Amino acid sequence: VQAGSYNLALSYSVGLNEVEDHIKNYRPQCLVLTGPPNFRPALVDFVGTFTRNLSLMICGHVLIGPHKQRMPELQLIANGHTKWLNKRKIKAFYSDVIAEDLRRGVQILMQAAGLGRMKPNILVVGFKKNWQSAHPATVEDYIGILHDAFDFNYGVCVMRMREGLNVEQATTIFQSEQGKKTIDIYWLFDDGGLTLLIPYLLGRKRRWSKCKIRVFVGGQINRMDQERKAIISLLSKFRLGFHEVHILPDINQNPRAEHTKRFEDMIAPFRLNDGFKDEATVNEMRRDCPWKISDEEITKNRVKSLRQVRLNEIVLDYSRDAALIVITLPIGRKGKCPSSLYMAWLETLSQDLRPPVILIRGNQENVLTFYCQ
């Protein structure tokens, strides 16, 4: 039995080497950063909901610290984790690596995990709920994980839940049918279509097939009808079957004074308080702490920070009771956006909700097409 299963698996995996890649056949192959899969069952459940027998799903665990690999204990624990995953009826592969820190292990997994064409192209990581009351080095490493994911051409998906992800198996929200609630999609920027593909595949399961999908797109106050018509036409060309389209004409409006003050206080303990010197003469103080923010950087990114804090209000007043909130994840340029600022943006976009909030971002490459080549 095992021999025959291995033979079939190997034959088909090798045969897949001959098949060429096409946009019509694009599949989201997810590398889920779960650690021990029983610690964060919400991530596993959510990813397996839309990945089940549709695309590759890998649960990545990084064993921090130095060790001479091998040993029978590593295999025993890997077998235990695989058994736990199988008991939950989750079609996923468990993969663990040994590295000095989380960033190195994630890099190893993103570089080597997979088999031929069956290799991940999306990174799914949980939100760092405790990023403020923690050593800034950890925050820098987390943002560096995101940066490495982008550097490898991966699509990034950040999952946030109100109570966090770290906890007979545990039961999560994604094991129960959502019902008539709505999946709210905020397609603010063109990333290729990942922001839409993930919710579309999610709604193709029986647990989310009853949810009404709402798409929110930015626009102009004097061209709302035209923008709505154009976006509806685009969605119909994609044949995604999304119900409602809303246009937000006030994303550039200045946010309330209380919320901007809250955002300012959030990054207060990361202010390097040195933004009156040349960038050349400001990296000396960052040599040991490459996470502080310089007043020049804050002055340049003020508009983007305000846009983040205002998008939070827009989401709060629209998606208060949705079953899922999908927001396009903003991109911060390397070297011009300190890890603290990126973390603050991610915290500000998703807050004060009851969030199954997903921040998605494709690699700027089309994953949808209205063509049959």
Ligand X SMILES: Nc1ncnc2c1ncn2[C@@H]1O[C@H](COP(=O)(O)OP(=O)(O)OP(=O)(O)O)[C@@H](O)[C@H]1O
Provide the annotated binding site for ATP.
Answer: 33, 40, 62, 126, 128, 130, 165-166
For residues 44 and 314, which CB has a smaller minimum distance to ligand X in the complex? Answer: 44
- Report d(CA 152, CA 149) in Å as an integer: 5
CB distance 215 to 245 below 8 Å: yes
CA distance 368 to 249: 26
Residue 293 as a binder of its own copies (CB under 8 A): the answer is: no
24 binds its own copies (CB under 8 A): yes
Stretch binding its own copies (CB under 8 A), from 34-42, 170-178, 182-190, 343-351 = 182-190
Tell me which of its own copies, ligand X, none is bound by residue 158, counting a contact when its beta carbon lies within the kind-specific cut-off of 5 to 8 angstroms: none
Residue 129 in contact with ligand X, rule: CB under 6 A: yes
| Nearest Cα residue to 157 out of 21, 68, 321, 33 | 33
Number of residues in contact with ligand X under rule CB under 6 A: 18
Q: Choose which of 65, 68, 180, 265 interacts with its own copies (CB under 8 A).
A: 68
- In this structure, what are the phi and psi dihedrals at residue 71, rounded to the nearest 5 degrees? 65, 155
Among 31, 143, 165, 353, binds ligand X (CB under 6 A): 165
Residues with Cβ within 8 Å of 191's Cβ and at least 6 positions away in sequence, in order, are: 155, 328, 360, 361, 362, 363, 364
Nearer to ligand X, 164 or 249 (CB): 164
Nearer to ligand X, 188 or 343 (CB): 343
Q: Which is nearer to ligand X, 33 or 197 (CB)?
A: 33
Closest approach of Cβ 123 to ligand X, in Å?
10
Q: Which residue has the tokens 């996470």?
A: 291
The answer to whether the CB of 298 falls within 8 A of the CB of 158 is no
- Examine residue 52 and tell whether it contacts ligand X (CB under 6 A): no
292 binds, among its own copies, ligand X, none (CB under 5 to 8 A by kind): none
Other Cβ atoms less than 10 A from the Cβ of 2: the count is 6
- Residue 350 interacts with ligand X (CB under 6 A)? no
Please state, in angstroms and as integers, the Cα–Cα distance from residue 15 to each residue in 12, 243, 367, following that order. Answer: 5, 39, 24
Q: Does 310 bind ligand X (CB under 6 A)?
A: no
Residue 4 and residue 18: Cα distance in Å, rounded? 22
| Phi and psi torsions of 302, nearest 5° | -55, -45
Does 80 participate in binding its own copies (rule CB under 8 A)?
A: no
Residue nearest to ligand X (CB): 126
Query: Which position among 28, 29, 34, 48 is part of the footprint of ligand X (CB under 6 A)?
Result: 34
- Whether 139 contacts 338, CB under 8 Å: no
- Asked if 94 and 61 count as a contact pair (C-beta separation under 8 A), the reply is yes
Q: Which residue has the tokens 């839409």?
A: 196
- When CB distances are held under 5 to 8 angstroms depending on the partner's kind, the choice from ligand X, its own copies, none that residue 130 binds is ligand X
Binding to ligand X, residues 207-266 (CB under 6 A):
none
Under rule CB under 8 A, residue 364 binds its own copies: yes
Site for ligand X, rule CB under 6 A: 33-35, 40, 60-62, 102, 125-126, 128-130, 138, 142, 164-166
